[PDB]
């Protein structure tokens, strides 16, 4: 198996995020979502596999951060400017039919960090970007 | 907007279950799934969509608890003996294309039980079961 924990980083007080979705994809053996110490731990079968938490600001901001193993490494991607229709279980699912995101998966990302329309950064960075035991910042600017 | 708040009550000390996963349809501008005072609460942006929970056992039990809105009218239903690739995501958007779950969803039950095949019971009843501000009981034997 492989388990990737994540720890959020809030750092501009002129909103506030929360999680309001968190999935997990059907291949190897599927997976968890748990919470240890206020950590996100993704649990997964085996590559091959992620899970996509979505977060949402009373603003109306919102995104979601993927993380995952492909081909027995770590990835991850964030999405933004979501529509209502976009929700973390139709994003999830994008990244195994979508090219685009099928793509972003490919890359095997342990860092990556996009802006939104507004102007806010969001970071994923894995601090332990090895082995089966990962580790991860999300950083909300 | 419909909300849909769920209470988990745990009666049988044989088993531990705990959420792995939590999923919004995205129809009706899809939602939103919180937590307050250890209450799961779903808000929905209008009538037509629904969200998963799923919970597993350190045993290997697991199932899934659906709850939604369907013409205005709540709804819900329970899956068990899940399979490994059977993930909360996989199981809601089954009730936007799957015969039997769409037939489940459309019957817009305030109380719904099933036992898995190991004998437990599992029941969903709507203590709050009609307008726009809806509450659930999910019962776990």
Redesign the interface.
């Known amino acids: 198996t492989y388990k990737i924990t994540v720890r959020v980083y809030q750092t501009n007080p002129n909103a506030f995020f929360?999680p309001?979705?968190?999935?997990?994809?059907?291949?190897a053996?599927?997976?968890?979502?748990?919470i240890t110490d206020d950590q996100h731990v993704l649990t997964m079968?085996g590559s091959g596999t992620s899970g996509t938490l979505?977060f949402?600001a009373d603003n109306g901001e919102s995104f979601t951060a993927t993380f995952g193993v492909h081909n027995y490494k770590r990835w991850c991607d964030i999405v933004t400017n979501l529509a209502?229709?976009?929700?973390?279980?139709?994003i999830?699912?994008q990244y195994y039919s979508q090219k685009n995101r099928e793509e972003a998966r490919e890359r095997q990302l342990s860092n990556y960090e996009v802006k939104n329309a507004k102007g806010r950064n969001f970071e994923i960075v894995y601090t332990e970007a090895e082995g089966n035991d990962l580790h991860a910042n999300l950083i909300i600017g």
């Open positions: 929360h309001v979705e968190k999935t997990v994809w059907k291949y053996n599927g997976g968890t979502w748990t079968g979505r949402h209502a229709d976009e929700t973390g279980m139709v999830n699912q």
